[PDB]
Amino acid sequence: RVLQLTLGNSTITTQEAANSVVAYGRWPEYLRDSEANPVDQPTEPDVAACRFYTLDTVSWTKESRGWWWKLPDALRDMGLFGQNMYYHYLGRSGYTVHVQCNASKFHQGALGVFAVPEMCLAGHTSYQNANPGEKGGTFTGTFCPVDYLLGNGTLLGNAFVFPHQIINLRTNNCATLVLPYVNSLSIDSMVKHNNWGIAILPLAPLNFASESSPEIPITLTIAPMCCEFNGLRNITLP
């Protein structure tokens, strides 16, 4: 079984969506009428920008400590989503983060893919520093935040309270996280404020047979879902 998914002009291949997690069991959804207002006015461009965007692949090695991305930050140079994210002032969007990872049967290791709401990292006081964009940042084992603390002084073993998946190479080699819009507000600035944060840390480290490929690829494919923004909506009276 091999499921080929098309969004817009963009096509990806998934071995199977057999174990695809939905954070808090809540699927992405537009701003409902009970929480909307015809005078605080949204529009829905979930036509074109809401497609699969595939970041530049990262290379998992024996020495890799982890990687992280912020959202909608990572997609701030990604075509129409990045355009809308700057043209519009207020926006909301869920995501579908499909972390594929390509390894042989003679590689071994495990990744913990964690989706974090309000992933405030720390050695933080800098926008460019806290928002690396498309390439994301990396963790450490001692700026760059600490592996076992997630940066936020926080034992990684408890990280599984967050929405997550485990990519254990002997079993599954891909993970999917369906993230709804999570914020204290129904809608907010995308450029000033990242709602979600992806963090991929090797729980079990990479290892492999003698002369296998030394560094395997982890690929992220992020699809905005139910992307909606403001709000140019003017009434001209006679």
């Binding site: 005078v39 605080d40 519009h88 002032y89 140019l232 909506r233 001209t236």
Partner: protein
């Protein structure tokens, strides 16, 4: 002009076609010294949070013979105001024909509390220069009026009035 009768009149005249706006009004009804002391702004100063729409209404007070066009542009929040007529036209705008309608109304929707420059802009540009028939004066005045809509909402009273 301030604290006079002339502080209420935007004068249109005949001068080189600089696409600088006739006016560019920022939509901070609580903190903008123009909109601040309007009745709307006076009430908003009594409250901490507020949200709704503002209808602005420009009224032409020239001759019945005068003819021309103005461009009333609306820049949403987060967008810096347009500096030229083309930038204004490619955005949200109303071409107001003076000879046909003496007023132009524009309802701006995304007005909310400052804190505790954003909100947007209402700009006015010359699309055309004003055409008069004879020795009719080539110096007119447009007035402007602002109000909240029925939807508009305030809350958490903050009377701050001392000496």
């Amino acid at each position: 002009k301030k604290n006079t009768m002339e502080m209420y009149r935007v004068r249109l005249s005949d001068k080189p076609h600089t696409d600088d706006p006739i006016l560019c009004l920022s939509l901070s009804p609580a903190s903008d010294p123009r909109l601040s002391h309007t009745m709307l702004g006076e009430i908003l100063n009594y409250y901490t949070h507020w949200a709704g729409s503002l209808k602005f209404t420009f009224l032409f007070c020239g001759s019945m013979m005068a003819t021309g066009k103005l461009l009333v542009s609306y820049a949403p929040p987060g967008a810096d105001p347009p500096k030229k007529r083309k930038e204004a036209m490619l955005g949200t705008h109303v071409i107001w024909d003076i000879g046909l309608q003496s007023s132009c109304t524009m309802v701006v929707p995304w007005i909310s509390n400052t804190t505790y420059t954003e909100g947007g802009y209402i700009s006015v540009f010359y699309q055309t220069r004003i055409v008069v028939p004879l020795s009719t004066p080539r110096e007119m005045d447009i007035l402007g009026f602002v109000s909240a809509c029925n939807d508009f909402s305030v809350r958490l009273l903050r009377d701050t009035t001392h000496i």
